[PDB]
Ligand binder design. Structure first.
Ligand SMILES: [Zn+2]
Length: 623
RNA sequence: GUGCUCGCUUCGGCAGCACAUAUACUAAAAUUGGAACGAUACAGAGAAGAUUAGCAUGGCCCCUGCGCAAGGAUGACACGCAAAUUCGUGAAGCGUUCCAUAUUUU
């Protein structure tokens, strides 16, 4: 009854959301642990719900204890839970059906001089376009990145909502703990926040006591904080955390216990962000790209903090240093900023008004291209990327292992600037590292394309748009050479240049003969309608003129000029070509290879099919 | 949220009363690396035992056609077809059973 069919004989489990490819696999799923566990959960939940009662209207600010002991006379209580948000209502779980029947049998209840609302409980079962439009009209790619920052950051209302949530959590925690504060970190304060980002909190006040404190935090969060659900603990890791959600505001996030290192990391990130102007748009763009291409997330992927540290390291290892090394920051931190946590020195200047500006001049487009290229080149497995020194330490030396005693090496090595034994890319497996390298190579060779270099006038998804939309390009390259009519190589190459220049209106530069060709209008389309107009006008004007060898090129040039004039409505300055390509001829077999260079609209296939019909006819009329 | 006030009101609201206050916060740990088993998809090779891989449409493909009627013209895109023959077995896809000095915030 929980199985819903699917095409190709598919089967799915509604509970587990797990598909099966055939009947035996479905039966195995139906008879194995995951499914039974879920049917036991649903059966127990439905039974408990049916043997349950709903209480409202009880006197304001009355604890569950007296209500439970009042209901004790009517039957054996099992669980009483009170509302978080306002405590208006409560649910009393009874350890039987008879007592639930007894309590629902009465038409009147009294407790503490207030008529109660005892009532049976119901049981129930378990920017795609606007972003593109906003980024499709900027002046250039740098403006696109700045606008991406503008429309991807946290809006002021969202900031207010997050601050209200933080204040609520602070209030409840101060109610429980004697003296404590909640320091928001991560995206909340490092100025690298996006819409719907994690709300990460630090609770400021050998392992059993830590586990007990984490369990206390989980119990307090589950039982007192209004609107939170899905509280779970990860007590066995480098930093035990408790995860939660928040139904009213829709937020989710993590709570850690004793990491001041996170606070210092966040302040360092803010200092880097306000130390130069390129870093914030660069990190936002790289995070959006990595999220789109499915290599940044949770688990076996680059955490976005690791991506932020990677782009910071890229900014550090340039010949003109865009950002200073953390060693330089530690040296330039004056007296009073010397602090250390867990035996590790975390010192850097507090205000950006003291450090000299970087002498780096190259804009954000060049920085993005250099990031792609340099990250694609690096020997990630054999090199440790040290942020404190801005240097690639040799991983095989053994020194980086015995120096820090806790460094877990791997396919990608990247040490956070303050913890000396916390390579932040230990999650990444080999497949994810290889995918990162390959996608970086793809982006690197895309950045050299003229589409990323010049904005589109007619609208062709220029700028970051291809790097944001997934649009995995699986298109084959030039595989079909065009056969040409047998002519002497010099005559054939001359006649091709005439046909491209005169009959098609291409700009042609000389690059086996080869030429770069560029087109601003769709000269392959419409030609049948243009020729019929020219033929009608000629038949109305002065019939005559026997067709010579020169008359064919002149007639195709006129058919091309008509197709320009029918689109002249455009007034945009024609600085970017609608389609550019190479034309290349082999000496022996006299075949023409044609390859795209810039095709912002995906129109190269239409041009190629047109040239396959047109060029072997043109070279027949030019013999 | 709704109704009432034989209360102020500026005429919206405010101040009290009445119903209602929703039907929880419920633990559905996850990820990675191993091993074994079941499947059966695998561009998987013969083929669909002379005879399939073709589709139907739309506007595009060129030529002819004054075309005004159109004809071949066959590649792209969208639209729904679906594919069994009879057959073996995977990789980072489906399912099941164990293992891990293995991982989880920033
Ligand atoms: Zn299931």
């Amino acid at each position: 009854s929980d199985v819903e069919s699917l095409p190709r004989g598919g089967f799915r489990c509604c509970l587990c959301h797990v598909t099966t490819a055939n009947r035996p696999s479905l039966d195995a799923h139906l008879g194995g642990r995951k499914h039974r566990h879920l049917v036991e959960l649903r059966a127990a939940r439905k039974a408990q719900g049916l043997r349950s009662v709903f209480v409202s209207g009880f006197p304001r600010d009355v604890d569950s204890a007296q209500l439970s002991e009042y209901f004790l006379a009517f039957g054996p209580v099992a669980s009483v839970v009170m509302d978080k948000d306002k405590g208006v209502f409560a649910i009393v779980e009874m350890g039987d059906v008879g007592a639930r029947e007894a309590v629902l049998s009465q038409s009147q209840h009294s407790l503490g001089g207030h008529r109660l609302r005892v009532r049976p409980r119901e049981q129930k079962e378990f920017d795609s376009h606007q972003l593109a439009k906003a980024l499709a009209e900027a002046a250039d790619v740098g403006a696109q990145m700045i606008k991406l920052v503008g429309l991807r950051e946290l809006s002021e209302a969202e900031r207010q909502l997050r601050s209200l949530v933080v204040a609520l959590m602070q209030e409840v925690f101060t109610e429980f703990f004697p003296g404590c504060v909640v320091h928001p970190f991560g995206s909340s304060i490092n100025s690298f926040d996006v819409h719907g980002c994690d709300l990460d909190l630090f609770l400021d006040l050998e392992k059993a006591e830590g586990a007990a404190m984490l369990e206390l935090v989980g119990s307090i969060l589950r039982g007192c904080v209004p609107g939170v659900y899905r509280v779970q603990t990860v007590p066995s890791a480098r930093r035990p955390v408790v995860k939660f959600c928040h139904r009213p505001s829709g937020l989710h996030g993590d709570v850690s216990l004793s990491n001041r290192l996170a606070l210092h990391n966040s302040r360092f990130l803010s200092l880097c962000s306000e130390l130069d102007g390129r870093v914030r748009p660069l990190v936002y763009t790289l995070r959006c790209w990595a999220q789109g291409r499915g290599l940044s997330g949770s688990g076996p992927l680059l955490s976005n903090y690791a991506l932020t540290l990677l782009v910071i390291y890229f900014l550090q290892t340039r010949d003109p240093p865009v950002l200073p090394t953390v060693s330089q920051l530690t040296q330039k931190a004056g007296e009073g900023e010397q602090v250390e946590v867990d035996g590790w020195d975390c010192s850097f200047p507090r205000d950006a008004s003291r450090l000299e500006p970087s002498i780096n001049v190259e804009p954000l487009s060049s920085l993005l291209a250099q990031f792609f290229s340099c990250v694609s080149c690096w020997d990630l497995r054999g090199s440790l990327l040290s942020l404190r020194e801005g240097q690639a330490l040799p991983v095989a030396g053994g020194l980086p292992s015995n120096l820090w005693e806790g460094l877990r090496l791997g396919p990608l090595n990247l040490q956070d600037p303050f913890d000396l034994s916390h390579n932040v890319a230990a999650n990444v497996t080999s497949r994810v590292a290889g995918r990162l390298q390959n996608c970086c190579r793809a982006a690197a060779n895309y950045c050299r394309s003229l589409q990323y270099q010049r904005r589109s006038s007619r609208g062709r998804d220029w700028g970051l748009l291809p790097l944001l939309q997934p649009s995995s390009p699986s298109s084959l390259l030039s595989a079909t050479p065009i056969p040409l009519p047998l002519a002497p190589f010099t005559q054939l190459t001359a006649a091709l240049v005439q046909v491209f220049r005169e009959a098609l209106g291409c700009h042609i530069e000389q690059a086996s003969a080869s030429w770069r060709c560029a087109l601003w209008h769709r000269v392959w389309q419409g030609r049948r309608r243009a020729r019929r107009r020219l033929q009608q006008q000629t038949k109305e004007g002065a019939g005559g003129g026997a067709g010579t060898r020169a008359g064919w090129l002149a007639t195709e040039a006129q058919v091309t000029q008509e197709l320009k004039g029918l689109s002249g409505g455009e007034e945009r300055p024609e600085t970017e070509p609608l389609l550019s390509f190479v034309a290349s001829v082999s000496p022996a077999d006299r075949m023409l290879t044609v390859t795209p260079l810039q095709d912002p609209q995906g129109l190269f296939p239409d041009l190629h099919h047109f040239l396959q019909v047109f060029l072997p006819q043109a070279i027949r009329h030019l013999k």
